[PDB]
Point group: C3
Chain length 438, copies 3
C-alpha cells in the first residue's frame, strides 16, 4: 500500500432484476419475460413485470447510493428496452431513461459502470435462435457500439457480458434459466457465441474511443472433493473445467480446455479469427464469487461424470450455499497467477438470508458476517499482491433472484414489495462504515 | 498500514454533562442532581439542570457531527432517564429519546457508541447504598440487558462503565465527586462492585446476541517522579497501582494488585466466582488519557504514602494539567504489552482552555496544538504496532465539567449558555480536516 | 505511507483571473486593468472587467468545490480591491467580500489558502515605480500585515507572492505581462523587491501570531538540451539559472546565482539586512510546475546567450507546452535535495486544451490524461520520500489566462462566458474520483 493507490467501492444490480416497467416506455420483451410465464419455471410464479419499480424510483435508489458513500454503481442496460427488435431502431424513450440514470449518478458523484448483457436477450432475437445463432454475436456487437456511441462521453469503464456460465449452461443445457433449453450442443454453441460477442463488442467499443476501458465478468465456482480416490480428484478437475476454465481459457489463453472438449465429444463452432477476437486484451476482469462446490465422481452423470455433494456440518446461507471466505482469497490468488488479468474488480459478492422487518427495521447479522469475512478475505489477497482495484456488493436492493423469484433477498437495503419502501438493513450501515473508514 | 485496515474518528459526550431536561420527560434524579445541590460541591454552584439542553437540541448537535465528518458518536445513556427507580419500570419517554437520537445518528451515517454508566447513578439506588451495595452490580447488569434488548438491533459496540477510578476513589474516598463519600473501605467496596457490574453486564449483553461487542473504559494517569531516591521510585509504583493497576489488573489479569492490597490493609469483598466475571474477555479497551502525574514519597499521606507534586516549568492547560504528548505514546505501548487488549479505542482525549468569543467566532490555538500533538503521539504508537482502532475527541461541545462546572470548556464547539448557541472553534475546523485528510 | 500521514487536495484560482467586478465595490485599478487596455497586449483584446464574475458567483464556485470534495481552496486577495491606493485606508466593502468568501468556504469544510500577491499590483503604486521602487516591498508588507490582522483568526496557512519569475522578467524585461516594461536593470530591481517583499511580509505575518504558517510560490521550468556540445550544456545552466535559481537561491541560500549575476553584468540593489530577510525560514514551498523547456546556445541572444527550442515529436497541450510527467517527479526530487523545504505543496499544475460543448457537456480526455499522469508522477516522488503534502489543481474554472485571454481554458469546470454557466468537464469527475478513492 503506497501513496497514490486507489480502491473503488460499489454496489451492483441488473436491469431485469430491478427495473420493472416491463411493458412500458417502448420496451420489448426479453427471454426472461417469456421464461417467467412458464408454469414451474420460477418460484411462486414471480416475474419481472414490476420488480423494484426502479424504472420509476431510480432517483430514490441513487440517493441511497450517495448516502452509502459508494463511488461506483454497476448496473446493466436492458437490450430489449433500448432496441426492442434486437437489431434495428433505437427506442428513444429507453435511451432517455439511461441518460437520466447516468446523469443523476454523475450529479451525485457516482461513476456508473455499465454491463451490456446481463441475460435479458430480446425475445425478437431468441425467435431467430438466440445465442445458438452465430449472428447473435454480431447483433450484440452492433448494440454495444450504439451504446458506447451514446454514453461513452460520460461512461469510460465498460463490461460486455456477465456470467456466460449461466447464460450458456444454465440457459441451454440444464434449462433452469431462460431460454430454458436442454441440449449440450446448443450450450456449446451458445458459450462460443457469447464469448465471440464479448470479443466483437470489445473491439467495437474501442473503435468509438481509445480512452475507453473494457472487461468481461466471469463467475468462478472453486471445486473441492471430500474423497481421496483418483476419480474424485478427476471430478474436481472436470467441475473446474466446466464451470471456470471453459470460459476463462478462451478469454485469457485463446483456447477451450482440451480435457473438457474431449469429454464432451462435440465440436465448438470456431471460425477463422474467432479465438483472436475472444482473447482480445482486456483492461480488467470482473470477478463474481459466492461459494465453492463440493463434488464426487459419478460414472452415470451427464454431460460429465461428476455430481454435487451436500457436505455435512458446514455453514450455509439461505440459498443453501456454503460460506467459506478462505476460498475467495485462494481463488483470487489462483486467477491472478493462472490468467494474469491487468486488474480485477469484484463485480459481485454477497449473500441471501431470511430477513424479517421488526419495528420498521431489518437487522441481518448473518449478512453482515458474510460481508465482513469476504471483504477481509479479498484484502488478504490484495496484501499478497493481487491487483484487486474495487469491490461491488451484490446487491444494493433486494430484487428478482431469477428462478428463485423475490423470496431470496440479496440486498443490503430491504424492499417491501407491497409498498416499494426501501429499508436499509444492518449490512447497509456496516458497508457505509467500511467505505468511509478503510 | 495495509489494505483493509480501518480507523474510526469520533466525538464523545456524556448524558449528565450535556442533556439537561433533568426534571423533564419522566427522568428521575441522579446522585449528581443531589450532589450539585450542596453548596461547595461544584464551582459557582453550577448544576446539570439545563447544561447544553441537548435533550431538546439533539438534532442540531447531530447535524454538527455530520458537518465535522465523524464516523462515530460516543455518548452515554442516563440510567435515571430510562429507569428512574434504578430497577423496575422503563420510562417510555426516556427510551423514546434515545431511539430518536440513535435513529438520527444512523440517518446521518454516524455509528452511535453507547456507554451504559457515566457516573449518573439513580438516586433511588444510592438511597439503598449505591456502589457500596453488592446488589448494585446486579441492578446495573439488569439495566444493561434491558438497554441491549431495546437498542442492540442497531447498536453493535457497547461500553459498560466509564472511569471507575473516578466513581470509586473520587466519589467514595476523596468525596470530590458524587456521592461525596470519604471512606477507604467504601471506596474499595465501590471499586469491586463497579468492576463486578462491568463483568455481569458484559455477560448479559452477550446473552442478548452473539454479534455484540463489549468493552470497558479506563482512564490511565502515568506516574513519574523528579526525585532519585528509592522512596520516590516507590511513590511512582504506588501511584501507578492506585490510579491504573487497581482497575486494569482485575479486568485483564483477574486479580487486584498485591502491593496495593497490602498497603491498604483491607479486605476486598470478593465472593467466589467474582474475579472470573470481572475478567471476562473483552472486544476492546476504551482508553482515556489527558495527563501524567508527578509524585514524591510522603510518609504522612493517606491512604498511601505519596503526594502529588506540581512540577516546575512545564506547559499546562487551563485545568493546570501538564501537557506531555510523549507520555501518551508510551502509555499506549505499555498497555498493549502489559494487558494485551484485542484493540484499543481512545474514548477520551482533549483539553480545556479559557476561550473568548470575538466577532462571533472562537479561535483556540492552544486546544488545536494539544490536539495535533496528541494525535501525532497516538499514531506514533499505532506505527509501532499498537492496535489503536479509533479516536474520540472529548468533547463535541463545551459542557458541565463535574465539580468544575461550566467554567472549564473542553468542546471543539463552543456553547454560549445564555442562548444555547453552538459556535465551532478553530479546533473543530482542524479536527474536520484531520478526519478527511488522514 | 504510515498511519497519521495526511494529504490535502485543492483547487487554485487568482483574483484578477476570476473575480470580475473590476470597477465595482470600491476596487481601484490594477496594473492588469491598465495593461489589458493596450492594443496588442492581450489576445482578442480581452480583459478582466467581468472574467468569471466570481465576485458575485462565489457561492456557486464554493459549492462546486464541495461537490468535488476538495479540502482546500487556494485563492488570491486583490490588493487593489482591499487597499485601492496601495498604501492607506482599507476598503471595507472589499474586505467584506473576502470575509464572505472565507466564511463560506469554512461553512463547507474547505480550508482557504490565501496568496497575497498574484500579479494585480495597484496602479496607484505602479505610478510611483511599482516593483522597481524599493518602497514597494514595504508597501506590500504593510498590506500583508493588515490582511493577517483581519483574517488570520481563520486562515492559518499563507502564501506571500506567486511566481516572481513572471512579475519580474515577463513584466519588466520582456514586457509581455503587466506592467509591460522592457529593461534588464528594471527586471533585476523588480525581482529583488518582490523577494524582499516576500521576506518582509513573512516576518510581519509571523508577528501577528506565532501559529501562522507562511510560504512562497515559485514556478520551476526544468531545462534540457537536445545537443551534446559543451555550449549547449552551458545553455541549460543559463536557462536554469534565469528561470529557477534566480528566485530559489535567494529564498533558500541567501544569495543570487553568481553565474547569472556575472552574465548580466549588473548589480542587484542589495541593502544591509535584505538577504537575511529574503531567506527567512518558511513552513513550506508552494511549487508550480507545467512543463520543461528545451534550449540551445545562441551567442546573439540577450540578456543571456541561449534560445528556446521547440523539440520535435513530443506531446503538447493547447498552449504548445510539452507534456512530460517524468520531469515532474525528477523536479520534485531535485528541489527536495537542492533547497530542502520543510514540506512542498503543489500550488499549481494543470493543462489547457480546446474544449467543445456537446449536448451541454464537456468531454476533455487530454486534460484527464495529463492530470492522471502528473498525479502519478507526484506520488512517485512522495513514495521516494519527498514531503509533498498536497496538490492544488490549476484551475477550478476556466478563467482569464493573462496575455492569452479567455481562449486558453485550464478549468476542470468549463465556463460559458456568454451566460456564466459552469459545466463540469470529464476532468472534474476524474479529480472527484481521485480525491475520494486515494
Amino acid at each position: 500500500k503506497k501513496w497514490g493507490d486507489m480502491f473503488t467501492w460499489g454496489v451492483s444490480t441488473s436491469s431485469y432484476q430491478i427495473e420493472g416497467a416491463a411493458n412500458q416506455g417502448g420496451r420489448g420483451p426479453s427471454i426472461w419475460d417469456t421464461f417467467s410465464k412458464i408454469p414451474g419455471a420460477v418460484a411462486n410464479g414471480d416475474n419481472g413485470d414490476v420488480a423494484c419499480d426502479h424504472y420509476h424510483r431510480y432517483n430514490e435508489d441513487l440517493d441511497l447510493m450517495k448516502w452509502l458513500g459508494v463511488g461506483a454503481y454497476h448496473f446493466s442496460i436492458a437490450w430489449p428496452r433500448v432496441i426492442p427488435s434486437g437489431y434495428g431502431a433505437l427506442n428513444k424513450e429507453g435511451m432517455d431513461f439511461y441518460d437520466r440514470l447516468i446523469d443523476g449518478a454523475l450529479e451525485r458523484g457516482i461513476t456508473p459502470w455499465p454491463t451490456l448483457y446481463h441475460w435479458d436477450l430480446p425475445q425478437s432475437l431468441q425467435d431467430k435462435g438466440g445465442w445458438n445463432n452465430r449472428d447473435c454475436a454480431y447483433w450484440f456487437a452492433e448494440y454495444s457500439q450504439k451504446m458506447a456511441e451514446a454514453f461513452s462521453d460520460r461512461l469510460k469503464n465498460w463490461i460486455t457480458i456477465n456470467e456466460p456460465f449461466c447464460s450458456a449452461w444454465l440457459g441451454h443445457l440444464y434449462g433452469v434459466m431462460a431460454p430454458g433449453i436442454k441440449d449440450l450442443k446448443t450450450g456449446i454453441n451458445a458459450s462460443h457465441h457469447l464469448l465471440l460477442g464479448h470479443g466483437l463488442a470489445t473491439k467495437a467499443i474501442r473503435e468509438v474511443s481509445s480512452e475507453l476501458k473494457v472487461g468481461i465478468t466471469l463467475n468462478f465456482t472453486p471445486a473441492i472433493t471430500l474423497g481421496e480416490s483418483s476419480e474424485d480428484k478427476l471430478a474436481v478437475e472436470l467441475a473446474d473445467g466446466f464451470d471456470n476454465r471453459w470460459f476463462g481459457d478462451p478469454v485469457f489463453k485463446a483456447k477451450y480446455p482440451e480435457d473438457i472438449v474431449k469429454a464432451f465429444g462435440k465440436e465448438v463452432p470456431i471460425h477463422p479469427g474467432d479465438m483472436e477476437i475472444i482473447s482480445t486484451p482486456l483492461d480488467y476482469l470482473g470477478l463474481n464469487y459466492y461459494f465453492r462446490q463440493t463434488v464426487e465422481y459419478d460414472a452415470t452423470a451427464k454431460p460429465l461424470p461428476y455430481k454435487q455433494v451436500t457436505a455435512p456440518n458446514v455453514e450455509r446461507t439461505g440459498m443453501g450455499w456454503e460460506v467459506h471466505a478462505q476460498s475467495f482469497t485462494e481463488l483470487l490468488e489462483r486467477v491472478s497467477k493462472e490468467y494474469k488479468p491487468k486488474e480485477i474488480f469484484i463485480t459481485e459478492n454477497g449473500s441471501a438470508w431470511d430477513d424479517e422487518v421488526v419495528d420498521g427495521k431489518v437487522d441481518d447479522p448473518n449478512r453482515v458476517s458474510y460481508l465482513e469475512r469476504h471483504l477481509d478475505a479479498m484484502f488478504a489477497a490484495k496484501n499478497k499482491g493481487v491487483p484487486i482495484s474495487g469491490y461491488f456488493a451484490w446487491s444494493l436492493i433486494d430484487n428478482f433472484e431469477w428462478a428463485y423469484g423475490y423470496a431470496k433477498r440479496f440486498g443490503i437495503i430491504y424492499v417491501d414489495y407491497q409498498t416499494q419502501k426501501r429499508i436499509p438493513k444492518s449490512s447497509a450501515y456496516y458497508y457505509q462504515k467500511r467505505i468511509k473508514e478503510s
